[PDB]
Amino acid sequence: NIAQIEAQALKHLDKPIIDLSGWQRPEEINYDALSQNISGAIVRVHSGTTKENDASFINGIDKAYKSHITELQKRNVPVAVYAYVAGKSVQEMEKAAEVFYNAASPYSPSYYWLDVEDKTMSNMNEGVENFRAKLASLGAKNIGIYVGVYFMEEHSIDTGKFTSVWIPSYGSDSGFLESSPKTDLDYDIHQYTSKGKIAGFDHDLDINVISPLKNKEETFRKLFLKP
């Protein structure tokens, strides 16, 4: 039940939050082990490549998302989703948002995240908003933005209409927390390394933590326990 998931999450609150994509092969993940070593997970569903790869189809659909979502949800881990935002026009942005929503919504994800990291439209702020607005109109309520500080400032990426902000800052990228986002914007969650190692998986993992500037339990509830 819902109280059960919530109790497990309270119990595991100091375990890290991971994000995963098709680059992390489900067959290489011991989900039993991984689920007891994490508090939550954020799974890639879409990337916005004409060449073929192991992590997604040409239409942007991630090759592993059904596995990552189902295997973690069955183990009572709360799971949110993300899309790499890369439309070259409003039309592409709205298309990608629809593809993303339709693929992820069946799983009742705890949050939808826009992963914004390169300029694919002249006014990237407008394109990002196109994506966000479309997702909202399709029914997404929890819509957050992942964006680096320098990118956000360079392209005047407005985070105001999003319901949460997620920011990467790796320092040297050692696998450990070593530098926090260089902004006074009030973000909820910090991607601190791309080279984490967690029991249950042998290879590099993106690891995240709720910002120590927030109340940890309340912010975790916000991001993971309110779909």
Author numbering: 15 to 62, 65 to 243
What text appears in the publication on this structure?
The sp0987 gene in the S. pneumoniae TIGR4 strain encodes a putative single-domain protein belonging to the GH25 family. Functionally, GHIP can hydrolyze peptidoglycan using the active site located at the mouth of its barrel structure; in addition, deleting the GHIP gene has a strongly inhibits S. pneumoniae virulence.
Therefore, in order to better understand the function of this novel virulence factor, we elucidated and now report the X-ray structure of GHIP at 1.86 Å resolution. The final model consisted of 227 amino acids (residues 15–243) and 200 water molecules. Due to conformational disorder, the N-terminal residues (1–14) were not represented in the electron density and therefore not included in the final model. The overall structure of GHIP consists of one domain shaped into a flattened ellipsoid with dimensions of 30 Å × 38 Å × 40 Å. 14 amino acids, including Asp56, Ser58, Ser84, Tyr121, Tyr123, Glu154, Glu156, Asp157, Tyr185, Tyr209, Asp212, Ser233, Asp243, and Asp245, form a negatively charged groove at the mouth of the GHIP barrel. Analogously, the four corresponding residues in GHIP homologs, including Asp56, Asp154, Glu156, and Asp245, are also strictly conserved. All mutants showed lower hydrolytic activity compared to wild-type GHIP, suggesting that these four residues are located at the active site of this novel peptidoglycan hydrolase enzyme.
